[PDB]
Amino acid sequence: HIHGLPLPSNIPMIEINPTRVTLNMEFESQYYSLMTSDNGDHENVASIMAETNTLIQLPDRSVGGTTPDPFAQQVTITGYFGDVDRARMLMRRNCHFTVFMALSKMKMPLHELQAHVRQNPIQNVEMSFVDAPVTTYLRITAREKNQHELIEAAKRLNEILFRPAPENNFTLHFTLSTYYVDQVLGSSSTAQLMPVIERETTTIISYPGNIYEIKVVGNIDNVLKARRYIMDLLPISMCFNIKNTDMANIHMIIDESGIILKMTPSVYEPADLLSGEVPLNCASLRSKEFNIKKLYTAYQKVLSKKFDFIAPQPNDYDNSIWHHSLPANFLKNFNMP
């Protein structure tokens, strides 16, 4: 209970359907362009929207001020709950990611390597060279679903470059929204969450605005594992409105699973009639991505049985080390916008 409310409204509400919701997730802006491009493989955002009959929006906000923009990298998916979940999965699998390989120490001259890569192009594994202020690095990029194709191409290259390959020849740059630094990495009143990932993935993670960079180092397999655990920590939330007659001060609830239900009473008072007052609630469910399977369950509970529906129980995150090694406090973010 948390004592300008309720939220008034005059625009004619066409409908107040609980099954109509928006999902919010965090996606790294450095890939926005690549999620857009029509690679002709029917996999970009447009494609997904079309096949999921949903609306997906990538932000483009230049925010400044005192506090970092909490929406710097937040993407929203809106539509029927059943389709939104399917678009959740398709946006992760199809999303690109990048990894850098240290060319230092390689036997063959760089020029020959360039020739190789230039004369052998894979359709799902873009490769390009870049020089960090002055050693050169190889940039490899692919969509999540083709992670097997990328690793192999990488491991094929090590073989070819060290006819004894170093054990920290890979680096990944994860861009988190500074805002969430306290919730992902840790805060003064919590445990430091990255050290745990290092211990479980044999990787090194160093870190220092709206964008915060987390640097991960280690073999290719471990890094992509660190990435996954880091991403399991990204916050997630689902919004929707609900007529009082359709349920099973600001209202917040925390179950013993980590989901947070926030209800903001609002009212729709017509302007053309000056009668009829439909009392409704603005709901919002939060939690960390990996715990999404428990968010839907929380959702099913708010909806009335009359809707006779079951929430989908995704399994994309069942192997998260976070289901047993994450301190409770981390899933209790009451102030999150």
Swiss-Prot record:
Phylogenetic placement of the source organism: Eukaryota, Metazoa, Ecdysozoa, Nematoda, Chromadorea
Function: Required maternally for germline survival and embryogenesis. Forms a complex with gls-1 which promotes the oogenic cell fate by freeing the translational repressor fbf to repress sperm promoting factors. Promotes maturation of primary spermatocytes to mature sperm. Required during hermaphrodite development to promote sperm fate, which is critical for determining the normal number of sperm. Promotion of sperm fate is at the expense of oogenesis, possibly through the negative regulation of fbf. Required during male development for the continued production of sperm and inhibition of oogenesis.
Gene for this chain: gld-3
Further comment: The deletion mutant gld-3 (q730) makes no detectable GLD-3; it is predicted to generate an mRNA with a premature stop codon, which should be subject to NMD. The deletion mutant gld-3 (q741) removes the fbf-binding site from isoform A, but leaves the gld-2-binding site intact. Animals homozygous for gld-3 (7q41) enter meiosis, but are feminized. In addition, gld-3 protein that retains its gld-2-binding region, does not have the dramatic mitosis/meiosis delay seen in gld-3 null mutants. By contrast, sex determination was not normal; gld-3 (q741) males produced oocytes.
Protein name: Defective in germ line development protein 3
Residues of the whole record sequence present: 89 to 454 of 969
Membrane-spanning parts: none
Domain KH stretches: 20-94, 96-161, 170-233, 235-302
Tissue expression: Expressed in the germline (at protein level). In adult hermaphrodites, first detected in the transition zone (TZ), weakly expressed in the early mitotic region and in pachytene germ cells, and becomes more abundantly expressed as germ cells enter diakinesis (at protein level). Expressed in primary spermatocytes, but not in secondary spermatocytes or adult sperm (at protein level).
Subcellular location: Cytoplasm; Cytoplasmic granule; Cytoplasm, Perinuclear region
Result of knocking out the encoding gene: Loss of both maternal and zygotic expression causes variable lethality, ranging from arrest during embryonic development to soon after hatching, and sterility due to early germline defects. In these animals the germline precursor cells Z2 and Z3 are smaller, divide more slowly and their descendants remain small and indistinct compared to their wild-type counterparts. In addition, some of these animals show somatic defects, including a protruding vulva, multiple vulvae or a reduction in animal size.
